[PDB]
A and B are shown apart, each in its own frame.
Chain A
Amino acid sequence: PQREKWSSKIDFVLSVAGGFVGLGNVWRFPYLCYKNGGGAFLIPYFIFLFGSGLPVFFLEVIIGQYTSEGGITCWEKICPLFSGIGYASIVIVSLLNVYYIVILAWATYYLFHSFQKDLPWAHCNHSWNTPQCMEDTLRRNESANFTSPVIEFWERNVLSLSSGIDNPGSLKWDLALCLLLVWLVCFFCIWKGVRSTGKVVYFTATFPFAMLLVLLVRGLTLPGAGEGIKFYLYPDISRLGDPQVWIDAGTQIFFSYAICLGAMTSLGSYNKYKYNSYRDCMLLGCLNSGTSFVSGFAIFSILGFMAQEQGVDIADVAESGPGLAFIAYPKAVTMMPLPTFWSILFFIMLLLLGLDSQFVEVEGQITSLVDLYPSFLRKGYRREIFIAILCSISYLLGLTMVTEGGMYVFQLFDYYAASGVCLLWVAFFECFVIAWIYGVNRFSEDIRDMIGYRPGPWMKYSWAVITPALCVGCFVFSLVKYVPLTYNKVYRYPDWAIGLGWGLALSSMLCIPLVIVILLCRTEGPLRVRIKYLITPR
């Protein structure tokens, strides 16, 4: 049958507006900026933004719009030999659909802890804390082996952090039930219902941004926030000599745009043909980058206040890892009037952003995997069993990283499984196939037929030159100057855990050469005939 189309021009805007404006902006860009020194992260961030990420965002939206198929089968008319890029995207989003939702579990664990009249991270006289904990207000009053209540609540109550990935500890029942609650919300809000329609247009679209503006106003007026903004903006140029900044910023663009996932292609698949995706895509990419930049201003003003209050330097005041949004932002919540109310509203904001940017990516995965097998998964009894099986398998695989040694597995997934050199591999192969095996001229002619105009010399030369050169250069540079993944600057990962992370990255990567080999083996003839048959669009 006819698949679906957007029953507005605003359903696409609302779908991608909550699609790639999520925790990659308010949670991930903070610690990836903080981990790489603040100012030095913004140069490759904007290089990959205006050279790669917005062109690949437009690229996948058009590959959805032209080939009205999602993720995998969209390459059936875009050189089917590289159909595995679609498969690669699904592996990426599958791994993303595990680890991303674990964040929301932590947010939900912070949401249930926010209903107390006295916040548990606002003071340390609890059971979970060390005796070395002092209040942040008192660290300039006593005589440097001292720790903050927010970091102690994050590490020994939420995470319950163990000695390493070698010691997973016991499964946290609190966090496992929070993770189960968040998948129950997700599974009840994909297509087990119908569609969130009435409430998504105003509360969803504005209240995360309103709470981000409230957090920005709180952060910028905190004492000592100027040093935090100086950390955030002013670069260390020699830090650009390390490949970590380039790989972190490039795959943070590709993560934050959800753009090697088969999801923006899936949301472009529901676009009408003659629909101007270019202007909407650039306004929404501007929204995404501005949300990241403004939320970074907020959180780094808060970190500058924390460094002012504790006396420790800005680069050491919080976690150089995935808990920076769960350390700095709750600390700013305790600096607001009536902190309980802002705690509930802030973690409702994080939950809303994460659930939107999980409904959208799970929709992309489902859309691609049912365009891959139509009439095996119809619109009825089968795409409830399939949704439940996918959500249950993703929840069970997310139980491995929500345990007591679960931050180490989470940092492994976040560095490797869906936001690393796998993203560079898939983005390079997308831009390479469009540019040279399909043609920027042929694809630009396809673009004009429905958008109305030729893409300029920026998009054409970004798909042609800029994005393959940036992806190849950062992929090569992260391997010829390879430093291993470390969690919070002090935990050295073992060889087997780095191998497991490279296994996740390679399971994402190797869907392209495996599909190339499979389709080269299932077509009869000599090699120059098989390749020519498999690069002709169908």
Chain B
Amino acid sequence: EVQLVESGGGLVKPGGSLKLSCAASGFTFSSYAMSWVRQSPEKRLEWVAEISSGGRYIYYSDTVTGRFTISRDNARNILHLEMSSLRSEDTAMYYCARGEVRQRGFDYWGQGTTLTVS
């Protein structure tokens, strides 16, 4: 039973910072690449940031390419997304999605964190 539980989503000021937390359970977390995928209040899905299995291949989208930092904790099984300089158009519902096989997609998603910028 693969379970990803997201935490740490609240209200931050514009230009502020926040640290998310995808606690993962039910699978060997060190052997699966992870992603943070956000969903806009217009209910459109935008992929934010992928980290590899050991954390060495880290990819960002063009919106968050210099202000978001995704990290892992394979010893404790927590995926982190440290944010900084959060602008207005980053208010979203953040899911962590387990995508390791690129031909299997995000076969296991998590819950949401409602990050609001105001």
Chain A residues with Cβ under 8 A from B104's Cβ? 453
* Interface 9-residue window, one of B8-16, B83-91, B95-103: B95-103
Tell me whether A452 and B53 are in contact in the complex, defined as CB-CB below 8 angstroms, given that A441-B30, A441-B31 are known contacts. Answer: no
Closest to A441 in B: B54
Query: In the assembled complex, which residues on chain B have CB atoms less than 8 Å from the CB atom of A454?
Result: 31, 53, 100-101
Bound complex: CA A448 to CA B33 (Å): 9
Cβ–Cβ contact B102 & A452, under 8 A: yes
List, in ascending order, chain B residues with CB within 8 A of A444's CB. 31, 53
Size class of the A contact interface (CB-based, 8 Å): under 10
Query: How distant is B86 from chain A, measured CB to nearest CB, in Å?
Result: 29
Of all chain B residues, which has the CB nearest A274? B102
Do residues B31 and A449 form an inter-chain contact, with CB atoms below 8 A?
no
CB of B52 within 8 Å of the partner chain: yes
- Closest approach, in angstroms, between the C-beta of B106 and any C-beta of chain A? 14
Whole-angstrom distance between the Cβ of B108 and the nearest chain A Cβ = 15
Set A441, A442, A453: member contacting B102, Cβ < 8 A: A453
Determine whether the beta carbon of A445 is less than 8 Å from that of B57. yes
A444, B57: Cα distance in complex, Å: 12
Q: Say yes or no: is B56 at the interface (Cβ < 8 Å to chain A).
A: yes
Main secondary structure of the interface of A (DSSP, over half): helix
Q: Could you say which interface size class chain B belongs to?
A: 10 to 19
Binary contact track B75-118/A, C-beta < 8 Å → 1, others 0: 00000000000000000000000001111100000000000000
Rounded to whole Å, the gap between the CB of A132 and the closest CB of chain B is 65
- The smallest beta-carbon distance between B59 and chain A, in angstroms, is 9
Please state if A453 and B103 are interface contacts (CB–CB under 8 Å): yes
Query: Using an 8 Å CB-CB cutoff, how does the interface string of B43-68 with A read, 1 for contact, 0 for none?
Result: 00000000011101100000000000
Do B54 and A445 touch (CB < 8 A)? Answer: yes
Q: What 1/0 mask marks residues of chain A from 428 to 470 whose CB sits below 8 Å from any chain B CB? A: 0000000000000110110011001110000000000000000
Most chain B CB within a 10 A radius of its CB, from A442, A448, A452? A448
Please measure, in the bound complex, the distance between the C-alpha atom of A445 and the C-alpha atom of B53, giving whole angstroms. 6
Min CB–CB distance B34 → chain A (angstroms): 12
Q: How far is the CB of B29 from chain A (nearest CB, A)?
A: 12
Given A448-B33, A454-B31, A441 and B103 touching (CB < 8 A)?
A: no
Q: Is the Cβ of A449 less than 8 Å from the Cβ of B100? A: no
Partner of A449, one of B30, B52, B101: B52
CA distance A442 to B31 in the complex (A): 10
Known A452-B101, A452-B103, A454-B100: A442·B54 in contact at CB below 8 Å = yes
Cβ–Cβ contact A449 & B54, under 8 A: no
> Can you list the 8 inter-chain pairs with the closest CB atoms, starting with the nearest?
A452-B102, A453-B101, A445-B53, A449-B57, A445-B54, A445-B52, A452-B103, A454-B100
A-B residue pairs in contact (CB < 8 Å), sample of 26: A441-B30, A441-B31, A441-B54, A442-B54, A442-B56, A444-B31, A444-B53, A445-B52, A445-B53, A445-B54, A445-B57, A448-B53, A448-B100, A448-B101, A448-B102, A449-B57, A452-B101, A452-B102, A452-B103, A453-B100, A453-B101, A453-B102, A453-B103, A454-B53, A454-B100, A454-B101
Chain B residues within 8 Å of A, Cβ to Cβ: 30-31, 33, 52-54, 56-57, 100-104
